[PDB]
Design a protein around this nucleic acid. Structure first.
Lengths: 187, 49, 124, 52, 147, 49, 83
RNA sequence: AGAGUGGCGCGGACGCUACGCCGCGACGAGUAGGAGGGCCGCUGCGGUGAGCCUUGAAGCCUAGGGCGCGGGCCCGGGUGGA
RNA sequence: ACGCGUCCCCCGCGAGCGCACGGGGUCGGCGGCGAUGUCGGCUACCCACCCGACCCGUCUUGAAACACGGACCAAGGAGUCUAACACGUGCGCGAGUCGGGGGCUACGAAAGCCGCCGUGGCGCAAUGAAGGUGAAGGCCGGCGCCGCCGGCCGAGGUGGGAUCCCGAGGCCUUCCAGUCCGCCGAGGGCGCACCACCGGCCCGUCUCGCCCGCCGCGCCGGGGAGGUGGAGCACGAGCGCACGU
RNA sequence: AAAUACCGGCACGAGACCGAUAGUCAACAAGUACCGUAAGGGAAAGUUGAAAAGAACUUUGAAGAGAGAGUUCAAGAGGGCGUGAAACCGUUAAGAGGUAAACGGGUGGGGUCCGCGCAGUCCGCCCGGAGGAUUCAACCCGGCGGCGGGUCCGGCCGUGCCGG
């Protein structure tokens, strides 16, 4: 008898994506070939972002995209964005770029085609840089959802900065006893 | 064209067209004229099946 | 286009068999009735079909031309070879090698032609 | 067995609501009936418009 | 989906996933909010405290029509008006400020959060914040009130 | 919009632009070796010593 | 893709005609069978008539259980009933 | 497995259902309860097998065979007539 | 331990062969018996003999129990739906989505369209019972000096950090200087997501004094600094449907 | 008067509803038969043969009940007559009987029947004995198809560019 804890014997990460589409799976099986042949970590990170689904990635914003492009040290250098780039309306000036992504919204596509940007697919990017020669690998900010206000410390507790599940906030909903100092106590 | 053979239709009778016929098809008012049009277009085996 | 529709064909089709742990395809261009991507002629541009004739006289060959994209009938052309097995397999090997038309399935076409001539050989 | 942190509600199902059941069976029937009544009214008033 | 449930996989069980001793009975604890002060006090007051009691003046005949007042920011001010005005604002060398009506968009109070490009526009709204007024007087633009 | 333009993965992989800088495929099957006893067997002990 | 071939529209008698019309872009559309199958299973359910079992059957006949004993298995049985 | 500037012949297997293949190692108990897979089965709906048969459809028995680690299936013999 | 043209402390290709304790069984060795009862029968029919062998479900820590119910068999037969949620997964567009109500055109109570039918829900802005308010700033001159005339930069800073960029140079052929391409690398940064803190701003309120404003010069109105509390800002992300727990 | 409700009745149509212990309790002379002094309660129940061609004729026996014939494709459909399941009983054949009975493992013996075994797969290449087929290397004529007419020509296409 050997005392081996068999709890963490199988890795809980995905071996295949749960989505059912024919255009994504062929690209996934091609990046399997590229990740097993190329020794670089670039194709492995691209493959792992192909494992992470829509719920596992945040939507990237155009304002933060331009803000990260304003950083130095990336002049004349393309950025490979895996997730979707949503249009942000709080922008006025935009230079020419080379945007390559899965899904770009129509207002952002109109702005890029007005500025003079060449939108290309991932197959020509893989032909240009298989190992990732001359690319910037970026990811969106994950702290951009409503549920993060509910994560963390439990409410009804002193110093708990967490939004409780209230059906409707107002003047009488959860105000008298637990909030006031006169009516009983407060936390 | 492979999905038509996977469904099971007789694809051999049409030589080359994603079939578009002239505007005089609606002018026919006879089943014998319809059968004659199907024999001229050779697409009779799919209905014989 | 090529690898895209194969995932749709392999899911549901009338020619595919699912019984007695035997997953195979029964397409007429599919030689040896084996379900694979290499064993297909409908999707690929180059198509080689080894079939017996209506009578028991040799092997008919169904060749596919360059212009065949949406043509079911007028793309393919039929010819009939009625000779002995040695010169028949030699002519098929010359068609595969010297004409440079689909040099992939060489031994399988040889075994298929041998099985077809063994089948159309008259019974004792 | 009440669960963890979530919303709270007052489900008004203590009464016998199976007695008073009125679900939408005749939505397209009422639409076709109003359509035929409007066409009959439009055929009734011949010089007058639909609005009036 | 009856075949896509756990009730087909759990065929051949005594209590159907409800323990050997403590079976799935009718009401072990109570019905709804039964005993909220005695023994469900630990359940309710730890997660959601504050509901027990009165607060404020009881406003009986309340209406949301007078209380409805949405706000608008200076950052999304150019998003409402088309792009030809943004061309003409840079084209104007004299400084003819275009008229941007907030009542047409359906907002009353104008606040200031983000960056505004340095060119004057005419803003016609009902309310104006003091810091947004300072930004308008710093950049360029008027503040026409409306009744 | 389409997700990919040139839908021919074999034509993509047979291109020289990818196949220029790649590693060689290690196509060699390695089965397990039967560990013979060097105390009993003679010329295995001569090999490793 | 963006490249679209030319279609020779045939006549009704069988032979080809002289009119040639450019192929539309619908014939080069991306294929998605999952959404088609989902809308198929929705629309095949959206033309189905409901059915019902008579609710009053069972509560019209009155009964009363005697309880334990009396050679019964604690089932409400028929009172009287000389048949 | 580099590249340049100078002193007789007409031949060679399996492979690749890439949701497939096998290579090298570790382990095999476990109720309640949770997770995954069933080419396990019943009855219905939309298509499909140029599906089946009064020269035997379905259902019932069997000292006959084999397929399975299993939920089950196939024909040999009797009833049987859609 | 075994030709020499090339550095001493010191007296870069030879051709053939036989057999193998050399990466998991072979024979280039054999013998019998078989056409009217013999040959094979593990699966299945019966019997004999050896070992083990308390009657199935419930209860409780503990049941085969002198604890409970059970004569046998065919058929029937016991976590289902709506509403509201917490989480996970798939699609669509995206600061928008949603026609679920209304109107227009046998199967088809199918289906198509509306956009001046988006009336309306949700959310991109919080804090107060309310009167209400509302979510950066910095640099340089005119002025030991407050207020304002001007210009410029702009959504903060530090540390740990995926991967890219540059490269001290290196990567062998009778000879040597010697070109672009390819691979690796001493070392240095822009620093992705994420974590830790310091920040700055808003709202209700406490303390402290001062500066401003006027068609309506006061028990007026605005502002500054340090704390306290906030489901806050720190550069959107949700909406509509289908399934499971 | 107008758009609102309909579970009973008058005429129908349709169904991813059920199929003789199911479906309205009632598919048939069903609130019918029946029970209670009464307000009341409340059943069981389909499938001959396409066609009755429903068995004439002989005999036993008082008749009941048998034994031969006839009809039909078949009585294998015999007046409670679609097919013929188990629990239960008996008969024909086989096996065992002083530690109720049976099962799990190892085999042993006898038969049930199955192997259509009882003179036993062969296949590619070379050579020889006598063979047969006007039959091959090689060369003209006609037809079809592919590599690439590199750098022959012109149209077509491009979510390409520059314009009128």
């Amino acid at each position: 008898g050997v005392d081996i804890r068999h709890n963490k014997d199988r890795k809980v990460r995905r071996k295949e994506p749960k989505s059912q589409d024919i255009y994504l799976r062929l690209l996934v099986k091609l990046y399997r070939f590229l990740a097993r042949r190329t020794n670089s970590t670039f194709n492995q990170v691209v493959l792992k972002r192909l494992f992470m689904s829509r719920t596992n990635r945040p939507p990237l914003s155009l304002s933060r995209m331009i803000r990260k492009m304003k950083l130095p040290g990336r002049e004349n250098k393309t950025a490979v964005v895996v997730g979707t780039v949503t249009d942000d309306v709080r922008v006025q000036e935009v230079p020419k770029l080379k945007v390559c992504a899965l899904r770009v919204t129509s207002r952002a596509r109109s702005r890029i085609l007005k500025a003079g940007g060449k939108i290309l697919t991932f197959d020509q990017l893989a032909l240009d840089s298989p190992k990732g020669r001359g690319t910037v690998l970026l990811s969106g900010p994950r702290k951009g959802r409503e549920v993060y206000r509910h994560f963390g410390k439990a409410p009804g507790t002193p110093h708990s900065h967490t939004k409780p599940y209230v059906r409707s906030k107002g003047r009488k909903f959860e105000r008298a006893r637990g909030r006031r100092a006169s009516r009983g106590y407060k936390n | 064209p492979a999905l038509v053979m996977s469904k099971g239709h007789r694809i051999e009778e049409v030589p080359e067209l994603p079939l578009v016929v002239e505007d005089k098809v609606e002018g026919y008012k006879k089943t014998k004229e319809a059968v004659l049009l199907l024999k001229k277009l050779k697409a009779w085996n799919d209905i014989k099946k | 286009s090529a690898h895209l529709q194969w995932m749709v064909v392999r899911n549901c089709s009338s020619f595919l068999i699912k019984r007695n742990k035997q997953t195979y395809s029964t397409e007429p261009n599919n030689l040896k009735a084996r379900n694979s991507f290499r064993y297909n002629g409908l999707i690929h541009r180059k198509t080689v079909g080894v079939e017996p004739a209506a009578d028991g006289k040799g092997v008919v060959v169904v060749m596919k031309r360059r212009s065949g994209q949406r043509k079911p009938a007028t793309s393919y052309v039929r010819t009939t070879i009625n000779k002995n097995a040695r010169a028949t397999l030699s002519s098929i090997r010359h068609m595969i090698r010297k004409n440079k038309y689909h040099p992939d399935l060489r031994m399988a076409a040889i075994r298929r032609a041998s099985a077809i001539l063994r089948s159309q050989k008259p019974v004792m | 067995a009440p669960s963890r942190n979530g919303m709270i509600l007052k489900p008004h199902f203590h009464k016998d609501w199976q007695r008073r059941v009125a679900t939408w069976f005749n939505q397209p029937a009422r639409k076709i009936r109003r359509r035929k009544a409007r066409q009959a009214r439009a055929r009734r008033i011949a010089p007058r418009p639909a609005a009036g | 989906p009856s075949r896509l449930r756990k009730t087909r996989k759990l065929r051949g069980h005594v209590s159907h996933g409800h323990g050997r001793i403590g079976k799935h009975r009718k009401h072990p604890g109570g019905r709804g909010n039964a005993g909220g002060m005695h023994h469900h006090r630990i359940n309710f007051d730890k997660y959601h405290p504050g509901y027990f009691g009165k607060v404020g003046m009881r406003h009986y005949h309340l209406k949301r029509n007078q209380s409805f007042c949405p706000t608008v920011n200076l950052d999304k001010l150019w998003t409402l008006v088309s792009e030809q005005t943004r061309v003409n604002a840079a084209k104007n060398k004299t400084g003819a400020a275009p008229i941007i009506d907030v009542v047409r968009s359906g907002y009353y109070k104008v606040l200031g959060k983000g960056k505004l490009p340095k060119q004057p526009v005419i803003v016609k709204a009902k309310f104006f914040s003091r810091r947004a007024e300072e930004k308008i007087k710093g950049v360029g633009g008027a503040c026409v009130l409306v009744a | 919009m389409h997700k990919m333009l040139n839908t021919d993965l074999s034509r993509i992989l047979k291109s020289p632009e990818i196949q220029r800088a790649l590693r060689a495929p290690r196509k060699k099957i390695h089965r397990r070796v039967l560990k013979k006893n060097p105390l009993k067997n003679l010329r295995i002990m001569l090999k490793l010593n | 893709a963006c490249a679209r071939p030319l279609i020779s529209v045939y006549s009704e008698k069988g032979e080809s005609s002289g009119k040639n019309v450019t192929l539309p872009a619908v014939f080069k559309a991306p294929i998605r069978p999952d959404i088609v199958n989902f809308v198929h299973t929705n629309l095949r359910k959206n033309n189905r008539q409901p059915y019902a079992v008579s609710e009053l059957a069972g509560h019209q006949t009155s009964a009363e259980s005697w309880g334990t004993g009396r050679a019964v298995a604690r089932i409400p049985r028929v009172r009287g009933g000389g048949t």
